[PDB]
């Protein structure tokens, strides 16, 4: 259960919470996360995004 963050607004993405109400349910691979996804605070082209996501191992 990793978590990412945007180096713009500073929004942490916890797969344990995610934005299931945005076409992205918890426990989702950042990879699967459709580029359509845009930080609700600093959208972002998913380019300024890093870290990990989705719970595993």
Please give the residue ranges that form the binding site for Zn ion (CB under 5 A).
6, 9, 11, 39, 41-42
Residue 9 annotated as binding?
yes
How many Cα atoms occupy the beta-carbon half-sphere of 12 within 13 Å?
6
Minimum distance between the CB of residue 12 and Zn ion, rounded to whole angstroms? 9
Nearer Cβ to Zn ion (24/39): 39
In terms of CB distance, is 9 or 16 closer to Zn ion? 9
Other CB atoms closer than 10 Å to residue 20's CB: what's the count? 11
Long-range residue pairs from 17-26, CB within 8 A, at least 24 positions apart, any chain = none
Residues annotated within the binding site are: 6, 9, 39, 42
């Amino acid at each position: 259960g990793p978590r990412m963050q945007c180096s713009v607004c500073q929004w942490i993405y916890d797969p344990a919470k995610g934005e299931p109400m945005q076409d992205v349910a918890p426990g989702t691979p950042w990879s699967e996360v459709p580029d359509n996804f845009l930080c609700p605070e600093c959208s972002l082209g998913k380019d300024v995004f890093e870290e990990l996501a989705s719970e595993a191992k």
